[PDB]
Design a protein around this nucleic acid. Structure first.
Ligand SMILES: [Zn+2]
Ligand SMILES: [Zn+2]
Lengths: 597, 76, 188
DNA sequence: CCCCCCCCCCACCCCCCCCCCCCCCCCCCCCCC
DNA sequence: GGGGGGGGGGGGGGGGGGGGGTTTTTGGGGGGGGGG
């Protein structure tokens, strides 16, 4: 007696699918998911009786936002919806459209059933999307086969590049040449359903409608190239790749170099032999049409900031695996904090170098600060394993080097003695001006590098000679060496009272399981976010008398500027908003140790 | 300017109407509805919103026809 | 007997076209798997009755007007739209086999041949495999009368418990010395 | 420190399409019942 | 006064014609590195 709305080719009723989804999208409780998964005894009513997707839709509607994330296992946890999971996997676009429409209907019905007043016109105007994810096993890109050609799949891989956003027409806009009447036409399966005659019966001219391109409505499309991860490849051949299409607010979900998951329908389409013909090649382009993407506190901060031993505590915590080099550790901690910037340029960078014998802990020290710092890099003074120090013009494009890439982070450079001369010259304007000047291919700019450098350098030959000065042992020239705030020597000279305890400390790491090593990054982050020290007036006189003292003892104003920056860094430590006399005194003292080399 | 605001609201009513006649996802997403009639026979349409609204499906199946009756014509 | 014999690629003269032959070589490169169409399926918007096109060729032309009598007997020029779900695809993969260093005559370039593999036999071939592949040697038109030609693969012959079997060597003994000597055993 | 070397990068058939012609269909007008 | 038939216009379909469809060597400049 009535028509039926059926998912084509399946005999699934769309009313049944709709209500099966509705009765989960409302009245599901998160406790059921722990029944499906392992560790079911961790169910807890005071956290798990929540109407999980009512909670999601409420926060979502208070944010007015269109998208819902949906772990597909939650369908299998709920009795009226376990079949909907199979329909979702096997017939995804229809089921997903049904789920989208159901989310919009839930939003509409909530503001009249839960009946709090809201802009019904806003919800009416808005589109809504489900993002199903964790659909199933992350089957290999190399394992896909033509049975997948309409199923919802899951992939993992590496983003190589993405197009700019591509406008994709959703509604064509037509205008009549004779009578200027206008009509909107939805694009159906990518085809413009052109009106052959003008709509208005009082005009009805044939072939008179014309497309007004910049009055059409466009969705956003983007194409991204995903390479097979080397974890999955067989050893003797190239990795594969798959192009994936991604739309609207999922555009620019990822960038070049991102390792990601995607959940998406595997799709295929024919391609033409030549554009002037309908003739199609007998095997289709394949792509995945994605619906979800994913990559790969203050109380304690203030509590720890009250401590008296904080300087030593934090300094030892940067590398507790390494035997005692404690003034180096203190210097590198102060480098992590850094000074302050000013408008007028003078900036907050602090720069450190380690020299002495090659076969010693300095490399591990650079590695540890690299692991700690938010956005630093590790490199060495010459060559390029597809990563190099200086900015460089190549094909035409400008590439930014490791110094420039380390903007706002510590740049760790090993083999700093063996650095090439053009690089040795280039370091001057980042040391002084924190920038590098580019003047080629019609582009002129001072490309701002804004990086603190931790250098690791070596003597000539196998051993450092401490009876000779640093300039006599090291290759790199004094005017560059002068720019470093703190400069250190680490030596392998035999002493059992050091070597035995080093060996016992080292060997004990294989047996054993205060050291806030994981809280260190959070402390550094909140300090850099919140604290901007200013110099006390008494600290002016302290800086002046200390500088004239070391001047009476070959100093330069670069040492005074260094003492300022170190004192400001010392004031970020302890979360102090104004540089104290003790901050100046420790900056002075540590520099007095360093300048004696 | 007030009357211009009135005009903009009047056409915004048309916007909230055509939105419901528009796909919530891109045109190539292309899920297929099948209308089974009251008899044992089936029609097919690609309308993504029409999957949940037979009103849209029926009037789209009507608009899909290539045929039009020919129409007739009709100084100092 | 011809399907038994392992020919080299240059021994596959033009006289063997259409015949089931077996070729011996090394796979030099392999394509990723792609869906070839066997039967395209079209939904019809204006009558619902689907129609089908079998494809026997490298290229095809898509149908537009509904040929079914449900439309045509009513002279209704309804529109056909391709559907992937109802179309039969087949797994397709192109590989290239190259004749081995012993098969190349003096001073010649190693010649090579495209292999087309369909269905369950797909991804039985990896690059670097030395292999006998039986298939139908066939032409493809693009030249004029010169032909492109390929091997429609049919059969593959590759040329090339532990947690307790390890106890054989454990009990055999002197394991470090003997296993060390077994690295390059002929080297003094 | 200076000069020279050497290294790098760069320059004929088949389909789509368009035009022309013929027939058929639909409307309007006039006559007949 | 309404319905049928005849005649003219307008539209659609079918047919026919036509046109289109990368590495390797050589030279030069500039940059980088090594030896006296
Ligand atoms: Zn008009
Ligand atoms: Zn039809």
């Amino acid at each position: 007696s009535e028509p039926l709305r059926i998912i084509w080719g399946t005999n699934v009723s769309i009313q049944e699918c709709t209500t099966n989804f509705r009765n989960f999208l409302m009245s599901f409780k998160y406790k059921f998911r722990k029944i499906l998964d392992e560790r079911e005894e961790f169910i807890n009513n005071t956290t798990d009786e929540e109407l999980y997707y009512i909670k999601q839709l409420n926060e979502m509607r208070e944010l007015g936002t269109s998208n819902l994330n949906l772990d597909a296992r939650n369908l299998l946890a709920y009795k009226q919806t376990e079949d909907l999971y199979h329909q979702l996997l096997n017939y995804p676009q229809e089921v997903i459209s049904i789920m989208d429409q159901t989310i919009k209907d839930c939003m509409v019905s909530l503001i009249v059933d839960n009946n709090l007043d809201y802009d019904l016109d806003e919800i009416e105007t808005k589109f809504y999307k489900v993002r199903p994810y964790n659909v199933g096993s992350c089957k290999g890109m190399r394992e896909l086969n033509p049975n997948d050609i309409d199923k919802l799949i899951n992939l993992k891989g590496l983003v190589l590049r993405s197009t700019p956003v591509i406008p994709d027409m959703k509604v064509a806009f037509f205008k009549c040449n004779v009578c200027d009447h206008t009509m909107a036409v939805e694009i159906d399966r990518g085809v413009i359903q052109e009106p052959a005659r003008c709509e208005r019966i009082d005009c009805n001219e044939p072939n008179s409608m014309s497309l007004i391109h910049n009055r059409c409505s466009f969705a956003d499309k983007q194409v991204i190239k995903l390479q097979e991860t080397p974890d999955f490849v067989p050893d003797g051949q190239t990795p594969h790749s798959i192009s994936l299409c991604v739309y609207d607010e999922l555009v620019d979900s990822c960038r070049a170099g991102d390792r990601i998951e995607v959940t998406g329908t595997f799709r295929s389409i024919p391609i033409r032999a030549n554009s002037r013909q309908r003739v199609l090649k007998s095997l289709y382009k394949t792509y995945v049409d994605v619906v979800h993407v994913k990559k790969v506190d203050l109380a304690k901060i203030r509590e720890v900031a009250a401590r008296e031993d904080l300087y030593s505590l934090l300094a030892r915590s940067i590398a507790p695996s390494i035997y005692e080099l404690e003034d180096v550790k203190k210097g590198i901690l102060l480098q992590l904090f850094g000074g302050t910037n000013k408008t007028f340029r003078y900036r907050g960078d602090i720069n450190i170098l380690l020299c002495g014998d090659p076969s010693t802990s300095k490399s591990q020290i650079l590695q540890y600060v690299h692991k700690i710092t938010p956005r630093g890099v590790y490199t060495s003074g010459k060559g390029s394993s597809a990563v190099g120090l200086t900015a460089y013009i190549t094909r035409l494009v400008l590439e930014s080097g490791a110094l420039v890439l380390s903007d706002g982070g510590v740049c760790c450079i090993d083999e700093f003695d063996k650095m090439s001369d053009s690089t040795r010259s280039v370091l001057h304007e980042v040391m002084e001006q924190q920038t590098i000047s580019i003047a080629k291919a019609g582009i002129i700019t001072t490309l701002n590098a804004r990086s603190s450098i931790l250098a690791s350098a070596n003597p000539i030959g196998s051993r450092y000679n401490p009876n000779l000065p640093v300039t006599e042992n090291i290759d790199l020239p004094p005017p560059l060496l002068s720019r470093f705030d703190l400069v250190y020597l680490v030596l392998d000279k035999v002493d059992e009272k050091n070597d035995r305890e080093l060996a016992k400390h080292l060997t004990n790491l294989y047996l054993e399981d205060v050291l806030p090593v994981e809280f260190l990054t959070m402390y550094i982050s909140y300090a850099k976010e919140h604290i901007h020290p200013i110099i006390t007036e008494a600290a002016k006189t302290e800086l002046v008398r200390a500088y004239v003292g070391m001047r009476k003892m070959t100093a330069t104003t670069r040492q005074l500027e260094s003492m300022i920056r170190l004192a400001e860094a010392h004031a970020k430590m302890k979360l102090k908003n104004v540089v104290e006399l003790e901050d100046v005194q420790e900056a002075v003292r540590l520099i007095r140790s360093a300048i004696k080399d | 300017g007030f009357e211009l605001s009135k005009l903009l609201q009047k056409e915004h009513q048309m916007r909230k109407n055509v939105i419901k006649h528009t796909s919530a996802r891109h045109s190539r997403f292309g899920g297929l509805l099948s209308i089974q009639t009251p008899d044992k026979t089936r029609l097919t349409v690609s309308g993504s919103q029409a999957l949940v609204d037979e009103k849209i499906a029926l009037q789209k199946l009507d608009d899909s026809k290539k045929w039009n009756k020919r129409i007739i014509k009709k100084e100092g | 007997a011809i399907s038994s014999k392992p020919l080299s690629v240059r021994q596959i003269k033009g006289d063997f076209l259409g015949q089931l032959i077996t070729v011996r070589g090394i796979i030099t490169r392999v394509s990723d798997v792609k869906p070839a169409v066997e039967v395209i399926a079209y939904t019809c918007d204006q009558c619902g009755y689907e129609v089908f096109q079998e494809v026997n060729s490298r290229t095809f032309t898509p149908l537009s007007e509904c040929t079914s009598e449900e439309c045509s007997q009513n002279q209704t020029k309804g529109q056909l739209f391709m559907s992937t779900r109802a179309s039969k695809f087949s797994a397709f993969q192109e590989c290239k086999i190259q004749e081995l260093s012993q098969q190349v005559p003096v001073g010649h370039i190693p010649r090579s041949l495209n292999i087309h593999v369909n269905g369950t036999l797909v991804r039985s071939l990896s690059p670097g495999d030395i292999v006998d592949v039986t298939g139908i040697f066939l032409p493809a038109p693009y030249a004029g009368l010169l032909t492109e030609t390929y091997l429609e693969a049919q059969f593959v012959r590759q040329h090339k418990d532990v947690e307790e079997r390890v106890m054989e060597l454990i009990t055999s003994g002197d394991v470090y010395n003997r296993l060390a000597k077994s690295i390059a055993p002929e080297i003094y």
